[PDB]
């Protein structure tokens, strides 16, 4: 199946952001999808999130863990532009300012860990 960027054109995504930011100036439009290579973690019902700009990474990680119904014990990582987000007090507003896509959305993918074994 197609990812978000594949289902909506660039100009179309730019418009989605213009509108949502117009209606919710204190919210950050975030796209969270399961990493293409991830195979153990479940797929979410929705991939579009509107996050209050004050919410920090610690809170985001936890609620997404909840959305996925994971135990604190299970491996979960939320990566932005290739790097994992640390469970800290950094506000999503700062991440948006430095990591957002040219289309206006902030993209994230989540994954767990690979397994190992030999022939």
């Amino acid at each position: 199946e197609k990812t978000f960027k594949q289902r909506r054109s660039f100009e179309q995504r730019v418009e989605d952001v213009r509108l949502i930011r117009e209606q919710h100036p204190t919210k950050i439009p975030v796209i969270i999808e399961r990493y293409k290579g991830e195979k153990q973690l479940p797929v979410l019902d929705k991939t579009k999130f509107l996050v209050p700009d004050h919410v920090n990474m610690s809170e985001l990680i936890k609620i997404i863990r909840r959305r996925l119904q994971l135990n604190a014990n299970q491996a979960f990582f939320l990566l932005v532009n290739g790097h994992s987000m640390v469970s800290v007090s950094t506000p999503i507003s700062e991440v948006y300012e430095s990591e957002r896509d040219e289309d206006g959305f902030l993209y994230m993918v989540y994954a767990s860990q690979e397994t190992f074994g030999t022939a």
Binding site: Y35, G37, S58, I61, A72, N73, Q74, A75, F76, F77, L79, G82, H83, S84, M85, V86, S87, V88, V109, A111, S112, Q113, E114, T115, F116, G117, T118, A119
Partner: protein, 311 residues
């Protein structure tokens, strides 16, 4: 008769470069410290695949070849922690030379039998409660989580095993754990995902420093389709102990097969799979405070793999 003892034959493998060699918090020179390097590497407890051991769960496998790779790596890093806890980082093994009783106590805990604290039997079966069928491949976090549960039954070691999730190390949670039953020896394991398909180059420097600390237990992970126990590095290469060799289960303890008496295998850091678990051992609170201090100083040139927070 006069004999040629072929000194350093074992290093016919290792490179020449003068770049230092780091092994679990210790630095060495390939030029003048070959004997020291080999002694340190050979002393580490090495666990490979085994065959013909008692059937796991009565009707399960009698061998772990092909599926126990990450379980064996988990055993090796945890054994190093035990070694540091009961024998100390300065301890060294010598063939045919009498070793402390604590040594045989550590080795026994990893022998392939149901009654041993950290045997392949205990790990595989404890793994079922983690959603892992017996014979199913493991990732780093999964084996670390299973080891934490098995350590609860080990009163001899009385370890505090903390597995920091979400790339975060909460000091306050660790202190409460180590002061709860005053300080239980701390085994700190940190599961990470340093990239999507490859490791981001920004993490390489931080990873190197993770092997340069006194508290360093090394790292478990591997190349795609090959789990390894990384004990250090030299240049742009990681050095490790490989479990991919099947040996007969020890049927009595003759321990030669549990020591790799050769310079360690090497692999380019760039080939490292992003899924790993970094480990640290802090004997006392002062050791832990020293560790935190060191992590804080890593705010150098090199993005951090994990963050240290108080609460």
């Amino acid at each position: 008769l006069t004999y040629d003892t072929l000194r350093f034959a074992e290093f016919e493998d290792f490179p020449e470069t003068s770049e230092p060699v780091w092994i679990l918090g210790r630095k060495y020179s390939i030029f003048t410290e070959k004997d020291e390097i080999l002694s340190d590497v050979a002393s580490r407890l090495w666990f490979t695949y085994r065959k013909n051991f008692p059937a796991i769960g009565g009707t399960g496998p009698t061998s772990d070849t092909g599926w126990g790779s990450m379980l064996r790596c988990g055993q090796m890093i945890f054994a190093q922690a035990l070694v540091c806890r009961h024998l100390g980082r300065d301890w060294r093994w010598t063939q045919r030379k009498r070793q402390p009783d604590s040594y045989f106590s550590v080795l026994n805990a990893f022998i392939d039998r149901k009654d041993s604290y950290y045997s392949i039997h205990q790990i595989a079966q404890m793994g079922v409660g983690e959603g892992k069928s017996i014979g199913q491949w493991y990732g780093p976090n999964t084996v670390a989580q299973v080891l934490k549960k098995l350590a609860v039954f080990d009163t001899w070691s009385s370890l505090a095993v903390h597995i920091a999730m979400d790339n975060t190390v909460v000091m306050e949670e660790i202190r409460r754990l180590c002061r709860t039953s005053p300080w239980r020896p701390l085994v700190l394991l940190i599961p990470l995902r340093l990239g999507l398909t490859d490791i981001n180059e920004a993490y390489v420097e931080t990873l190197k420093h993770c092997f340069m600390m006194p508290q360093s237990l090394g790292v478990i992970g591997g190349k795609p389709n090959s789990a390894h126990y990384f004990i250090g590095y030299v240049g742009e290469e990681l050095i490790y102990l490989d479990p991919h060799t099947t040996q007969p289960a020890v049927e009595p303890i003759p321990d030669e097969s549990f020591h790799c008496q050769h310079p360690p295998c090497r692999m380019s850091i760039a080939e490292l799979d992003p899924s790993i678990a970094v480990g640290f051992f802090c004997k006392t609170e002062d050791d832990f405070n020293d560790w935190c201090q060191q992590v804080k100083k890593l705010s150098l040139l090199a993005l951090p793999m994990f963050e240290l927070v108080e609460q």
